[PDB]
Each structure stands twice: as C-alpha cells, then as structure tokens.
Design an enzyme around this catalytic site. Structure first.
Site, PDB file in Angstrom:
ATOM      1  N   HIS A 118       0.816  -1.209   0.000  1.00 12.55           N
ATOM      2  CA  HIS A 118       0.000   0.000   0.000  1.00 12.55           C
ATOM      3  C   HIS A 118       0.859   1.272   0.000  1.00 12.55           C
ATOM      4  O   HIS A 118       0.304   2.364  -0.191  1.00 12.55           O
ATOM      5  CB  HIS A 118      -1.043  -0.008   1.122  1.00 12.55           C
ATOM      6  CG  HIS A 118      -0.527   0.350   2.480  1.00 12.55           C
ATOM      7  ND1 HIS A 118      -0.329  -0.614   3.458  1.00 12.55           N
ATOM      8  CD2 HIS A 118      -0.222   1.533   3.050  1.00 12.55           C
ATOM      9  CE1 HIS A 118       0.124  -0.023   4.562  1.00 12.55           C
ATOM     10  NE2 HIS A 118       0.185   1.288   4.356  1.00 12.55           N
ATOM     11  N   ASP A 175      -0.047  -7.619   1.671  1.00 16.22           N
ATOM     12  CA  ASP A 175       0.412  -6.242   1.736  1.00 16.22           C
ATOM     13  C   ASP A 175       1.927  -6.216   1.949  1.00 16.22           C
ATOM     14  O   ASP A 175       2.406  -5.985   3.052  1.00 16.22           O
ATOM     15  CB  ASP A 175      -0.346  -5.442   2.789  1.00 16.22           C
ATOM     16  CG  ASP A 175      -0.119  -3.940   2.747  1.00 16.22           C
ATOM     17  OD1 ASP A 175       0.490  -3.465   1.740  1.00 16.22           O
ATOM     18  OD2 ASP A 175      -0.591  -3.256   3.680  1.00 16.22           O
ATOM     19  N   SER A 217       3.401   2.612   8.586  1.00 13.17           N
ATOM     20  CA  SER A 217       3.194   1.627   7.520  1.00 13.17           C
ATOM     21  C   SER A 217       4.512   1.145   6.953  1.00 13.17           C
ATOM     22  O   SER A 217       5.371   1.962   6.673  1.00 13.17           O
ATOM     23  CB  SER A 217       2.401   2.203   6.316  1.00 13.17           C
ATOM     24  OG  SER A 217       1.071   2.531   6.654  1.00 13.17           O
TER      25      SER A 217
HETATM   26  C1  LIG Z   1       0.853   5.569   1.551  1.00 15.18           C
HETATM   27  N1  LIG Z   1       0.036   5.749   2.749  1.00 15.18           N
HETATM   28  C2  LIG Z   1       0.760   5.877   3.990  1.00 15.18           C
HETATM   29  C3  LIG Z   1      -1.300   5.791   2.672  1.00 15.18           C
HETATM   30  O1  LIG Z   1      -1.882   5.679   1.618  1.00 15.18           O
HETATM   31  C4  LIG Z   1      -2.063   5.969   3.963  1.00 15.18           C
HETATM   32  C5  LIG Z   1      -2.172   4.675   4.729  1.00 15.18           C
HETATM   33  C6  LIG Z   1      -1.746   4.437   6.005  1.00 15.18           C
HETATM   34  C7  LIG Z   1      -1.027   5.362   6.874  1.00 15.18           C
HETATM   35  O2  LIG Z   1      -1.343   6.526   6.974  1.00 15.18           O
HETATM   36  O3  LIG Z   1       0.056   4.879   7.411  1.00 15.18           O
HETATM   37  N2  LIG Z   1      -2.013   3.120   6.348  1.00 15.18           N
HETATM   38  C8  LIG Z   1      -1.795   2.484   7.636  1.00 15.18           C
HETATM   39  C9  LIG Z   1      -2.918   2.737   8.622  1.00 15.18           C
HETATM   40  C10 LIG Z   1      -4.062   3.406   8.220  1.00 15.18           C
HETATM   41  C11 LIG Z   1      -5.112   3.638   9.108  1.00 15.18           C
HETATM   42  C12 LIG Z   1      -5.042   3.217  10.403  1.00 15.18           C
HETATM   43  C13 LIG Z   1      -3.918   2.496  10.864  1.00 15.18           C
HETATM   44  C14 LIG Z   1      -3.818   2.035  12.197  1.00 15.18           C
HETATM   45  C15 LIG Z   1      -2.723   1.324  12.610  1.00 15.18           C
HETATM   46  C16 LIG Z   1      -1.667   1.076  11.741  1.00 15.18           C
HETATM   47  C17 LIG Z   1      -1.711   1.525  10.448  1.00 15.18           C
HETATM   48  C18 LIG Z   1      -2.834   2.246   9.959  1.00 15.18           C
HETATM   49  C19 LIG Z   1      -2.685   2.523   5.291  1.00 15.18           C
HETATM   50  C20 LIG Z   1      -3.168   1.223   5.152  1.00 15.18           C
HETATM   51  C21 LIG Z   1      -3.770   0.849   3.961  1.00 15.18           C
HETATM   52  C22 LIG Z   1      -3.869   1.794   2.942  1.00 15.18           C
HETATM   53  F1  LIG Z   1      -4.489   1.431   1.769  1.00 15.18           F
HETATM   54  C23 LIG Z   1      -3.407   3.087   3.057  1.00 15.18           C
HETATM   55  C24 LIG Z   1      -2.792   3.464   4.258  1.00 15.18           C
END
Ligand SMILES: CN(C)C(=O)Cc1c(C(=O)O)n(Cc2cccc3ccccc23)c2ccc(F)cc12
Ligand SMILES: [Zn+2]
EC number: 3.4.21.39
Length: 226
Positions: free
Chosen positions: A45, A89, A182
């Site tokens: 992602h 992922d 992430s």
């Molecule tokens: C390139 N990025 C970073 C993005 O597009 C934004 C994004 C994030 C992030 O912001 O890191 N995460 C992790 C995350 C999101 C939401 C809640 C969470 C609670 C715990 C751990 C991780 C969490 C994703 C997971 C799937 C996805 F498709 C997109 C994202």
C-alpha cells in the site's frame, strides 16, 4: 508510534524512511527496512509513481552525514495484493545503487529458519508515524514493545487471516503502531517477523501486520532474480 519511546539514535541501522509520490496529491510517507544493500522491504500500500528512500536517519528534519538519500529504480508489489481486503500487503524496492555500510546504515537479512510465530510473546516496532490520532508524524524515530495477540483479538477486521497476518497490540493499552508507521518491521528477539499494514482510524489496538514467514518464498524469488 503511540505510547513508545524515542529510539537511541542510529540503533536500528536497517530502518528506511520512504517518501511516496503520486501524480494527484502531495507526498505520503512510510517506513521500511534494508534487507540487502540494494533492497528495501515495505508494505504494498506504500507503492506510488516514484519513491525516495532515506537511510541513516534519526531526526528526519535535520540533515546529517549519516543520511543516504537513495533512488528507487523499480517497485515489486506482491502480484496478489488486493486493495479491498489488503491481503498480501508486501513490496520490495530495488535501489539504483547499493547503500554504503556505516555504523548508522546496515542490512537486516533473514535467518535461514522461517518458523511460524505463535501468539504470546513481546516484539518491538519502530517508525516516524503519528504519536496519536490528532498528532503529527514524529520528527524522531520512535519504538514500542507490543504483545502478539491470539487471532480472535483481530476478528473485527473482517478480512484478517491468522495464516497471513499477525495481530499486534494488547487492546487494554494505548501502545500501537499507527498512521505513518506503515511498512516498518516488527522485530521479535531481533528477527523481523511482521510488517505494519493497517488498523483502526481511532488507534485502538490491536493492529494488523503482514506475517513475513508466509512470504519468505516470494521474497527469495524476487531477490534471486533481480
Ligand atoms: C501511503 N500511505 C501511507 C497511505 O496511503 C495511507 C495509509 C496508512 C497510513 O497513513 O500509514 N495506512 C496504515 C494505517 C491506516 C489507518 C489506520 C492504521 C492504524 C494502525 C496502523 C496503520 C494504519 C494505510 C493502510 C492501507 C492503505 F491502503 C493506506 C494506508
Ligand atoms: Zn546522527
């Protein structure tokens, strides 16, 4: 990282800070880790049109001699990555050149063993992500010790699967990986066993991590062919 501590600077020399570019929004950011001098492992992602990698960082706002800013030449997203379920992922980034080995920059190769890690132990995760729901990303690398949970603790994530993913963080505590973390590694006794994948917007743990043992054959296949 919520509820953690500032890392001792440069104490995790495999840590990678990723800036992810897309055509139609500003930069986004992820973690990752250096597993060969020219390969970084992270979350699928975190793919984008182009990615930059910074090795050797502690405070990402203050340039220093330990920094190595490295170009990515190709992204290898897992071919079965699903944007709906978030299964598989995982992604490898090939760097244009091999990184320099320094005190602050080094690889974390896998050991030969790829045993399935059961629930119960404590592991540690690091990142530059948000330190709370309403808090910006940390300027310094942070880390937190988290409990591997039984899979039923992650049942509410309806697409979670125990075979594919680890369930990480005792729901009774605030401690957790979060947004901006992430792609970062979960280390258990110094061995990478998970990759931060997703969780709840409101930060209530547990969160879902990619289970590395399941993907060891794929990782090997990419590394051997490239
Ligand atoms: C390139 N990025 C970073 C993005 O597009 C934004 C994004 C994030 C992030 O912001 O890191 N995460 C992790 C995350 C999101 C939401 C809640 C969470 C609670 C715990 C751990 C991780 C969490 C994703 C997971 C799937 C996805 F498709 C997109 C994202
Ligand atoms: Zn330094």
């Amino acid at each position: 990282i919520i509820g953690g501590t500032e890392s001792k600077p440069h104490s995790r020399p495999y840590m990678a800070y990723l800036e992810i570019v897309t055509s139609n929004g500003p930069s986004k950011f992820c973690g990752g880790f250096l597993i060969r001098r020219n390969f970084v492992l992270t979350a699928a992602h975190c793919a984008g049109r182009s990615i930059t990698v910074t090795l050797g960082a502690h405070n990402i706002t203050e340039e220093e001699d330990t920094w190595q800013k490295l170009e990515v030449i190709k992204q290898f997203r897992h071919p079965k990555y699903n944007t709906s379920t978030l299964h598989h992922d995982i992604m490898l980034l090939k760097l244009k050149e091999k990184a320099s080995l320094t005190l602050a920059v080094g690889t974390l190769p896998f050991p030969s063993q790829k045993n399935f890690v059961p629930p119960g132990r404590m592991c540690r995760v690091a990142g530059w992500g948000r330190t709370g729901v309403l808090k910006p990303g940390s300027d310094t690398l942070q880390e937190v010790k988290l409990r591997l949970m039984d899979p039923q603790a992650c049942s509410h994530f309806r697409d979670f699967d125990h075979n594919l993913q680890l369930c990480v963080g005792n729901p009774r505590k605030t401690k957790s990986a979060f947004k901006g973390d992430s792609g970062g590694p979960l280390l258990c006794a110094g061995v990478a066993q998970g990759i931060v994948s997703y969780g709840r917007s409101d930060a209530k743990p547990p969160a879902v991590f990619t289970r590395i043992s399941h993907y060891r054959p794929w990782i090997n296949q990419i590394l051997q062919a490239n």
